[PDB]
């Protein structure tokens, strides 16, 4: 390259052809030579005809050359038109990346990936740099993407969105090499977003919390705090800035530097809101309403309501359950109607992904068993129906009581252990598999050796399944 | 004896692994409850249906400068963090 | 210990109220509510296997028919004077409860104890020989005789 | 046209941080071109970062003959499209006759510099007198004329770098012969058009430059780390 | 030789998995495969990939 540039320079007519010199030093990777012998003297530039060499440096993966060009000046939105995007997505976009994209759309759909599938269907036939960053990031370019990312305004949003896209494209099982490098680049950009937001929080907290909540004119149609959730970027939320934001949103008006027993004690004694024991930093009637509007104490009120509901259901179910419904059964029906309205309101504000969480599924299931208990309970004078309704209410009380575990996941002390509890299902299933194998292999052998031709189905399963099951608690089959 | 005390060992190993991920997953789950409780503008729960009627009342009747200001604030620490990368 | 007691109390109440409601009918004595809802599922943690659910090994010599003497009430009878509760809903209920408390929930407490012993051992000697100062100072603060004569001093 | 390599980027960012930390004015050309553009950018960045604690002062001094759109009021105007820079908070444009006349702004500028150099403000550790430092890093006639008009006056405190066009020929040599053979080895591509009848005057300019070399200091190439701007000034 | 580290690497594992599934692509969920095993004339439907 240096020999060809020395012969290309000393013809003494093409010295004015500095464009040919720059193109020659672009086809080879001479960065230092072009920087020292083209841009140093500042005698000649226009900052507008540098677009063909720009497009060539972009399509042929020249990141140091585009860095040296942008250091001396070019505006990217002036550079980009829709035709350049159609040339990039129609010709320079690979077909194997398209195949992995369509397999990922078939197997792993999401709102951001639906959005990028819609826009790639757009540009294979108002935010220029973000779309060029997307084109850079789906190709696993890994070095041009940094160069354009340093030029963006909404930087953390772009980093989190790129991390989401690459984590979703890394789950495709064919072409494992590309999935590996996309996984590497996804880890790189989630680390980059975390390490930028820690500085943006560690200088000015208020403007960092201004940054967290902006949608940036429908970047991907979402928010910076939502993109970490949708990618399950749980390290971005585990950092103390977002935790401080969430805790200050959780307590609300109450300052965090008061002890919480004072808060629940002020909840118990309602006219003690007007006393110097709690700080409302973050007139008196405003103190009253700002207390009864906080999320912490409305949750702490709803759990007391729920425990009182469980005690009322227990009293009705065990001690006062007659042929006609008495007064506490009617009060119970009113409370279940209030819970039913709250759950159907949460379903209407949530949609179809409401059935994603299993807790909402068993809440709907419990409400359905409750109304089944009502319609079995109202057909009076049939003792079979009036007993079956109470059996349905007992099997429903089991569900409503086991909801309390999910209710108390918010605590600082019980919470992480309850979250840990769901990581144990595979060991329980391994135990149950081996114990079921030993159970059957012992029970059938003992039943066949002892007795002769049992014809009753109930005393097959009481002697094959049930007694070797009890032999796990130390019964020693007699 | 064997099959129960093996379950104890597998529980102990699983508790040994997931504890450094435990706080991360818990304070990730904290976001969902904070957002689902702050999404509602309601009264205390036993009167919520009345406030629900208030929404039924609703159903009976019915580029920016500081944005670029805080983005231009963000770019300063972006450049500072790029210096902090290339300095070390 | 508090996490274990919280989960065990939840499973205890959810089993005891369901079993008392399925078996019997309108207990009016407060003592035989808490002996049958709280106390017997509590004993089922030490491997007792609550007896009143089998419908073949249930005799009427331990009943009362009305709250008159000590013993619990009967399960509510048929028109044929037979027990009404289904075995196919109370046998697997006792099986699921007995699995979920006597095995999973205790052997989880063993694992959490083992992990906590694994952490605090390098802090253990530091905290112990920090506590050594207080007893040395509270015993050296006194100029006394042996204890049975201290009142004289 | 202006090339801004990242060492100069770090130097001038550190400089404007120093000018905020000390509460200083910065006098500049004040146009929308290259170096003055980037100085205005860093002024805007230090304004948008802290928003208070002595918003810094940048006076641009322009010629009024180069400005594209000029609107006479008493009533604020709008300036869209030399071109004036957007981010200098004060602008002074010298008056003259016709338009195409450079170097008109230098006389009033250097007279103002001498007046602050004789102006005494007691609350400083210089014995009053408001200390003044002049920089130059680029090339051309105007840099040499400004440095010599400053050094002919007392106390310019001239600081130069070892990077640029005229910065190299001032940095490297520390009579006429060495001026010639360093000027041709570092800048042939401007002297290709220039007659010797004013190059002898340039040798006179640099002869007045190298008279008081204690009033001239340089930022060298090994001295390229942090805090090198405080160590020069 | 029982060189189990040579077989634990993802190349030989990818080879063995692609030999194990056979005609079915690995990027389909296995419940679809056993559900197509249960309903025999559901082999002719776009739920499994025979790539
Ligand atoms: Ca719910």
Author numbering:
A (entry chain A): 409 to 533, 558 to 714, 722 to 917
B (entry chain A): 969 to 1030, 1045 to 1070
C (entry chain D): 867 to 1019
D (entry chain D): 154 to 227, 232 to 238, 251 to 343, 350 to 408
E (entry chain B): 663 to 713
What does the paper say about this structure?
TRPM8 is also activated by ligands such as menthol, icilin, and phosphatidylinositol 4,5-bisphosphate (PIP2), and desensitized by Ca2+. MmTRPM8 is a homotetramer with dimensions of 140 × 110 × 110 Å. Each MmTRPM8 subunit contains multiple domains, including the N-terminal four TRPM homology repeats (MHR1 to MHR4), S1–S6 six transmembrane helices in a domain swap configuration, TRP helix, and C-terminal coiled-coil.
We first determined MmTRPM8 structures in the detergent Lauryl Maltose Neopentyl Glycol (LMNG) in the absence of ligand at 3.0 Å resolution (MmTRPM8LMNG-ligand-free), and in the presence of Ca2+ at 2.9 Å resolution (MmTRPM8LMNG-Ca), Ca2+ + icilin at 3.0 Å resolution (MmTRPM8LMNG-Ca-icilin), and Ca2+ + icilin + PIP2 at 3.2 Å resolution (MmTRPM8LMNG-Ca-icilin-PIP2). In the map of MmTRPM8LMNG-Ca, strong density shows that a Ca2+ ion is harbored by the cytosolic-facing cavity in the VSLD. The Ca2+ is coordinated by side chains of residues Glu782, Gln785, Asn799, and Asp802 from S2 and S3. In addition, the side chain of Tyr793 from the S2-S3 linker is positioned in proximity. To confirm this Ca2+ binding site in MmTRPM8, we performed all-atom molecular dynamic (MD) simulations using the Ca2+-bound structure MmTRPM8LMNG-Ca as an initial model. Throughout 250 ns simulations, the Ca2+ binds stably at this site, with a Root Mean Square Deviation (RMSD) within 3 Å. The distances between Ca2+ and CG atoms of its coordinating residues Glu782, Asn799, and Asp802 remain 2–5 Å in most time of the simulations. Therefore, it is likely that PmTRPM8Ca is also in the closed state, similar to the Ca2+-bound MmTRPM8LMNG-Ca structure.
